[PDB]
Amino acid sequence: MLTELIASNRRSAAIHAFVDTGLSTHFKDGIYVDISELSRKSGVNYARFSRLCDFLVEMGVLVSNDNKFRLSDECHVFANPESFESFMIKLEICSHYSNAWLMYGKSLFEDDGKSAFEMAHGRPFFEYLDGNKFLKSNFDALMTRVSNLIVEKLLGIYDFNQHNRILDVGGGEGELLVRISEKVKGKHYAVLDRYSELPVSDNIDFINGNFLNSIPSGYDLYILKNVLNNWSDSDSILILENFRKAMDKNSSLLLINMVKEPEFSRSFDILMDVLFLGKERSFTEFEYLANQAGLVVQETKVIDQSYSPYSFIKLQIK
Amino acid sequence: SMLTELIASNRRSAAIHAFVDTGLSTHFKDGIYVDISELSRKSGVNYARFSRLCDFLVEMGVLVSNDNKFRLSDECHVFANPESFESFMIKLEICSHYSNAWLMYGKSLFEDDGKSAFEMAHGRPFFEYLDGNKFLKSNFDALMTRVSNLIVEKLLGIYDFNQHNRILDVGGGEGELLVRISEKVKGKHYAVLDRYSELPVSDNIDFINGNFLNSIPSGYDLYILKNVLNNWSDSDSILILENFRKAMDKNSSLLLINMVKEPEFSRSFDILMDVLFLGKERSFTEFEYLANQAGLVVQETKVIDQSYSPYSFIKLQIK
Ligand SMILES: Nc1ncnc2c1ncn2[C@@H]1O[C@H](CSCC[C@H](N)C(=O)O)[C@@H](O)[C@H]1O
Ligand SMILES: Nc1ncnc2c1ncn2[C@@H]1O[C@H](CSCC[C@H](N)C(=O)O)[C@@H](O)[C@H]1O
Ligand SMILES: COc1cc(O)cc2c1C(=O)c1c(O)cccc1C2=O
Ligand SMILES: COc1cc(O)cc2c1C(=O)c1c(O)cccc1C2=O
Ligand code: NA
Ligand code: NA
Ligand code: NA
Ligand code: NA
C-alpha cells in the first residue's frame, strides 16, 4: 500500500489527462461510451486510452459495462468544462503549483515570510497572477463557481433584506453579490478587489482597493469570503482591524470560510501553507483573531457544501 | 468530499516529498517518538507549520500520534533510511521532469509519432535524456540498485545458478544483481551490459558498454533481463528477445524477470510506463506471446512475491 501512497500524484495526473484534453466532455448525462468509436472520432490512441480508462475504473471515475464506459454518478461534473472540479484539476497539478510544492520542504526552514510559491516564482501568489493569464483566469473562474454554489444556502440562513449598503471585500469577479442582487433588489452593491481594469455589471460598484491598507466606511453589511485562509495570523488580524475601523455600532461583517473540522482532510490546510503561508482555521481560531481585532462573534452557523463544511460567522464591533 | 480529495491526490505525494527529501524523516529512526518542539530547536524547522504537516502525515497513516509526539508507522520505518528504495522513489515521483512529462500525457494520446510524453516535454527519450542529467540518472540507477538488492535472496532460492558457467545481466545498470549473486555463487564468470560513458569497476565483474537493440554478445550459458521490457513497445521488446535468440545456443538459458500485471493490483505503474517510455506493465500471457514471436520457448515460470508487487520469473531457451 505504501508505494501506491507515494504514487498518489498518478491519480491526479490521470484525471488531468482525461479532463484537460476534453475527452471527459464525451461522457455527458451518464451515457456509456464505445472507446473504439471515441478513438476514430477524436483521434485518441485506442489501446493507450483503453489503459487510462482501466485506471479510471480502479479510481471509481469510470464504470465498465457492455464493453463501454460511463462517468460514475459523483463524477458527472467532469463532463462539464464549466464545473468547479474541471477548473480545480487544471490548477492542482499545473507547472506553477508543482514547482511551489517542490519548494515546500525548504520553505519550512526559512523565516523571511516567503511562501513556497514565492520561492519558486519570485512574487507572492496574487502579485504573480497579475502577469499570468492562465493562472488568473482559471483561479478567478474556480472562485466564481464555488461562490455560485453557496449563494442559495447563504440567502437561506441570513436576512440580507434588512441591509441597505453591501460591500463584498476580496469579492473577485463579484459572482457572490451579482447573484445576491438578483434575489435581494433595491440595495446598493459594491465589490472590492485588485483590478488593473474595473469589471462592469448592472448595479455593482467595482472598487480597486487593498484590504491590508484600508476598508471603505459607510456600509452596514461587509462580506469577507475565503480571504483569511490566504493570510498569516498577523495579516488576518490587520484585515479584521481595518474592518473594525470602517464599521460603526450598527454594521455587520459576515466572515465566510471553508472551516477545519477533525473528521475532514488536512490536505487544504497544507496547500494554503504552500501557496500563501496561510492556513485553514477552526471556529475557535477565527474567534481568537476577531477578538484580537476588537470584533465580537454575534452568530455562528455551519453550511454543508458537498466538498467541505463552511463556517458562517457574523461579527460586530466591541 | 471523496471526489475533491481524489483530484487532490497529488498533495499526499508532495507532503511525503517535503518530509523525506529534506531529511526530516531521518530523525524518526527505530520507531522512536519525536517532540516537534525539540526537533524545531535542533534543525530550525518551523514548529507550528511542521506540526500541521505531521497532522496530515498522521491522517495518511505515515506517522502515529500519542501525547503530542509523533513516530513513523511500522510500515513507514523505510522513510527514516535515506538508502531505502522508497526514499529514492519519492525523490523521482514528483520531480520537475516527471511532473512536466505527466502534463504532456493527455496531448501524447492524440500523437502517433512514437514520442513518449517525457520526450514531448524534454526533447529526448528517457534514457538518452538521463545521459545529460546526473540528478535523474544517479537517483534512477540508485532506485534500481535498491529493488535489485531486495529480490536477490528469493531469486537464488527459486533457481539453481550453480549449474551455470558464464552469466551476462543485460541492462544490469550498476550491476547490483550480479554483484550480490557472485558473493553467494562463486567461481563463475560475471558480466554486466548497459550504456556506460565510463565503465563501472567491481572485483570479478566484466562491465560491457553495449546496446541490446543492436546486438547481445554470444558465448554465455545464462542471460538475465530484469525490468527492461516494461520500458519498451511490443515491437522493440520482440527485437530485444530476437537479439537474445541470435546470441544463444540450444544449451543457453535466459531469465526474463519483471514486475507483472495482475488484476488485484493497481494500474498506476502501467500508466507511468506509458508516460515515461510508451512502455507497459505486461501479464504472464503477454510476456509469453512476445517470447514466442521472437522464437523463444518457455521452459519454466514462477511468481516472486515482493512487498510492493508480484514479479514474473520466466526461463526461456531457443526453438
Ligand atoms: N490586498 C488585497 N486587497 C484586496 N483583494 C485582495 C488582496 N489580496 C488578494 N485579494 C483578493 O482576494 C481574493 C481571494 S479568493 C476569494 C474570492 C471570493 N471572495 C470568493 O470567495 O469566491 C482574490 O480575488 C484576490 O484577488
Ligand atoms: N539500448 C540499451 N542498451 C543497453 N541497456 C540499455 C539500453 N537502453 C536502456 N538500457 C538500460 O536498461 C536499464 C533499465 S532499468 C533496469 C536495471 C536493472 N536490470 C534492474 O532491474 O535493476 C537501465 O539500466 C538502462 O540504462
Ligand atoms: C488555491 O485554492 C483556493 C484558495 C482559496 O482562497 C479558496 C479555495 C481554493 C481552492 O482551491 C478550492 C478548491 O480547490 C475547491 C473548493 C473550494 C476552494 C476554495 O474555496
Ligand atoms: C521508471 O520507473 C521504473 C522503471 C523500471 O524499469 C522499473 C521500476 C520503475 C519504478 O519506478 C519502480 C518504482 O517506482 C518502485 C518500485 C519498483 C520500480 C521498478 O521496478
Ligand atoms: Na476531444
Ligand atoms: Na486551486
Ligand atoms: Na546522449
Ligand atoms: Na546485475
DSSP A93: T
Elucidation method: X-ray
Q: What are the structural domain ranges in chain A? A: 2-81, 148-261+275-317
Let me know: does B255 contact B227? Beta carbons within 8 Å: no
On whether any CB of chain A is under 8 Å from the CB of B102, the answer is yes
* Residues β-bridged to residue A226: none
Q: How far is CA B123 from the centre of its chain?
A: 23
Q: Can you identify the CATH homologous superfamily of domain A148-261+275-317?
A: Vaccinia Virus protein VP39 (3.40.50.150)
CB contact set of B62 (below 8 Å; sequence gap of 6+): A5, B16, B19, B72, B73, B76, B79
In angstroms, what separates the C-alpha of B315 from chain A's closest C-alpha? 28
In angstroms, what separates the C-alpha of B184 from chain A's closest C-alpha? 29
Euclidean distance between CA atoms A33 and B44, whole angstroms: 54
Determine the residue of chain B that is closest to A269 in CA distance: B52
Euclidean distance between CA atoms B293 and A42, whole angstroms: 32
Reduced to 3 states, what is the DSSP secondary structure of residue B62? coil
List CB-based neighbours of ion ligand 6 within 5 Å.
A 91
What order of strands is seen across the sheet that includes strand B189-194? B205-209, B189-194, B166-170, B222-226, B253-259, B310-318, B296-305
* Neighbour count for residue A31 (Cβ, 10 Å): 12
CA atoms within 13 A on the CB side of B227: 17
Euclidean distance between CA atoms A299 and A258, whole angstroms: 17
Q: Do domains A2-81 and A148-261+275-317 have the same CATH topology?
A: no
By CB atoms closer than 10 A (0-12, 13-18, 19+), residue A194 is middle
Burial letters for A121-133: b for 16+ Cβ neighbours within 10 Å, e otherwise?
Answer: beebbbebbeeee
Cell of A14: 490521470
Which element (helix H / strand E) includes B151? helix B134-158
Task: Please tell me if the CB atom of residue A278 comes closer than 6 angstroms to any atom of ligand 1.
Answer: no
The CATH number of A2-81 is which of 1.10.240.10, 2.60.40.1220, 3.40.50.720, 1.10.10.10?
A: 1.10.10.10
- Strands (E) across chain B are located at 63-66, 69-72, 166-170, 189-194, 205-209, 222-226, 253-259, 296-305, 310-318
Let me know: does A71 contact A84? Beta carbons within 8 Å: no
By CB atoms closer than 10 A (0-12, 13-18, 19+), residue B273 is buried
Euclidean distance between CA atoms A8 and B62, whole angstroms: 13
Q: What spacing in Å lies between the alpha carbon of A143 and ligand 3's midpoint?
A: 7
By CB atoms closer than 10 A (0-12, 13-18, 19+), residue A213 is exposed
Residues of A in contact with B275 (CB under 8 A): 13
The reply to whether residue A88 touches residue B7, judged by beta carbons under 8 angstroms, is: yes
Let me know: does B185 contact B156? Beta carbons within 8 Å: yes
Data resolution in angstroms: 1.8
Residues of B in contact with A13 (CB under 8 A): 10, 102, 105, 271, 275
Angle at B199 between CA B198 and CA B203, to 5 degrees: 150
* Residues β-bridged to residue B310: B305
CATH-assigned architecture of domain B158-318: 3-Layer(aba) Sandwich (3.40)
CB contact set of A238 (below 8 Å; sequence gap of 6+): A212
- Specify the residue with its C-alpha closest to ligand 3, atom 6: A226
Q: How far is CA B45 from the centre of its chain?
A: 32
Euclidean distance between CA atoms A251 and A222, whole angstroms: 8
* Residues β-bridged to residue B263: none
